[PDB]
């Protein structure tokens, strides 16, 4: 503060001016070939055709996800990293407690080739695995879609039905309840045990817990990000012996402790 | 060539020095905003001189990755999450072609398994969601199903259709008017004239939908959301 503070501020201004001039000169020497990085223009939630996505309060939408158009997402649901829910030509509905895992594409069709064109409907407590493709089909509540599966238009996955990972489910195929289908093309594999129904339910419940920690981390401001970076650095290691010599006990701050519902134990 | 690469390298030394100088100047004024973790993603990224050339009418989603020598024609569209890598060889996309969301159009990273084939996409071509095209050629007015994989040396002739989820093995020539599907992809049936009409109508529609999406993304960035993110507590 004072005269010295102002003098140092002015000197720093001169230094920044020189630095930016040097940066420009270096860019010119590079031959203007390097494309400059710019402010991010990705929109997590975007309107189209005067349709606005309707997202419930406690829904984790990853910043890298693309939710576009007439899309409705219910309470407790989670849209993970790289997910694209493009509801531009029709409606996309997602129920409560449903996870759409990383790099998934969900799209619709304005008109199918034959039959009645329908929107994409995903029910409650539904798990959609990583990098799945859901196109113009219907997934009823408490269903399972394995990672890398592709559901075409008209596919119906019934309650307590499973589509195995990597399956290509042909158009208008119906997966009956208590059944697991798989392959390319998908076909009946076997029946689902009760332990597997328990697995499906526990999957959706585990993902609601995982969504909370991810939503908390992704919404932190710059100041909080820096505070927690410093805390993480300060508590990365320990010297409990010197603490005992000093007669103190160092405790992990609460901002660095995860909830018990996401820990392996 | 070598001289350009030397100049490009020496420019990085001058630039890194200037940026460090700017950081010093901010540290003297008590500013730490240079420490903010901001995304370094570039929609169009260059590898030295190899830069993407994109038509002024072609829509590219901001989250798409176009790397190296990648040519996009007029009326074409690159949708959300798509990745196009043209480093070891070139990638060309014809006019009026839609590359649907999360698709990957790339060339071989190394020449260990032979000469690196380029990827050629013709005009009015539909590439379905999450398809993988690796060093193949796709002729004009063809249909690639969502989730299909075309390996290197694959030729997809005009009016030819690759079914959804099909794995077309290396050097597999798809003849005109034929539907190939499965793993590995084999002949399934002959294409119908209604299917050819639907292919053309679909590509025309996607060019019109892309126009709509390219308009809404052009909207000025909302200062209200900027202020909301800045003032979070």
């Amino acid at each position: 503060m004072g005269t010295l503070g102002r003098a140092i501020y002015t000197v720093g201004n001169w230094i920044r001016g020189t630095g930016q001039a040097l940066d420009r000169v270096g860019s010119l020497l590079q031959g203007s070939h390097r494309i400059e990085e710019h402010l991010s223009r990705h929109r997590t939630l975007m309107n189209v055709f005067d349709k606005s996505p309707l997202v419930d309060k406690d829904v984790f939408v990853a910043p890298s996800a693309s939710v576009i158009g007439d899309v409705q997402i219910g309470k407790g649901s989670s849209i993970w990293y790289g997910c694209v829910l493009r509801g531009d030509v029709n409606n996309i509905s997602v129920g409560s407690g449903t996870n759409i895992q990383d790099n998934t594409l969900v799209h619709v069709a304005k008109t199918n080739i034959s039959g009645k064109v329908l929107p994409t409907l995903i029910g409650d407590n539904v798990t959609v695995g990583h990098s799945a493709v859901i196109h113009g089909c219907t997934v009823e509540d408490d269903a399972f879609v394995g990672m890398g599966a592709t559901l075409l238009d008209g596919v119906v996955v019934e309650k307590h039905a499973m589509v195995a990972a990597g399956s290509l489910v042909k158009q208008n195929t119906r997966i009956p309840s208590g059944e697991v289908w798989g392959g390319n093309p998908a076909k009946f594999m076997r029946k689902l045990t009760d332990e597997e129904i328990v697995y499906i339910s526990q999957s959706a419940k585990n993902y609601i817990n995982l969504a909370q920690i991810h939503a908390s981390e992704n919404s932190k401001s710059f100041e909080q990000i820096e505070v927690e970076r410093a805390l993480r650095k300060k508590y990365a290691r320990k010297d409990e012996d010197y603490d005992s010599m000093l007669g103190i006990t160092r405790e992990t701050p609460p901002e660095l402790i995860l909830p018990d519902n996401v820990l392996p134990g | 060539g070598t001289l350009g690469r030397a100049f490009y390298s020496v420019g990085f030394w001058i630039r890194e020095t200037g940026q460090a100088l700017d950081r010093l100047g901010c540290r003297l004024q008590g500013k730490n905003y240079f420490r903010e973790q901001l995304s370094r993603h570039r929609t169009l990224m260059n590898v030295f001189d190899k830069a993407p050339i994109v038509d002024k009418e072609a829509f590219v989603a901001p989250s798409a990755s176009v790397i190296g020598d990648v040519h996009i024609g007029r009326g074409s569209s690159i949708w959300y999450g798509c990745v196009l890598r043209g480093d070891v060889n070139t990638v060309s996309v014809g006019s009026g072609t839609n590359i649907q969301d999360n698709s990957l159009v790339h060339v071989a990273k190394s020449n260990l398994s032979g000469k690196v084939h380029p990827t050629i996409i013709g005009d009015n071509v539909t590439i379905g969601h999450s398809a993988v095209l690796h060093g193949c050629t796709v002729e004009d007015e063809t249909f690639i199903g969502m989730g299909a994989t075309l390996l290197d040396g694959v030729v997809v002739e005009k009016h030819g259709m690759v079914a959804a989820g099909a794995l077309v093995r290396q050097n597999t020539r798809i003849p005109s008017g034929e539907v190939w599907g499965g793993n590995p992809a084999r002949f399934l049936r002959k294409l119908t004239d209604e299917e050819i009409a639907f292919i053309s109508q679909s590509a025309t529609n996607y060019s019109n939908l892309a126009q709509a999406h390219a308009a809404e993304n052009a909207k000025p960035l909302n200062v209200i959301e900027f202020e909301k993110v800045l003032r979070k507590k």
């Binding site: 503060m1 004072g2 010295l4 503070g5 102002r6 140092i8 501020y9 720093g12 | 004024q29 008590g30």
Partner: peptide
């Protein structure tokens, strides 16, 4: 407009004095 960290300002002055003193030390030796 002004840098407010007074300890940092003192340290900046100390570094400047070190640099200028090193230059003068060389020039007069």
């Amino acid at each position: 407009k002004v840098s407010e960290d007074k300890n940092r300002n003192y340290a900046v002055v100390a570094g400047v004095v070190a640099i200028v003193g090193s230059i003068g030390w060389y020039l007069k030796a």
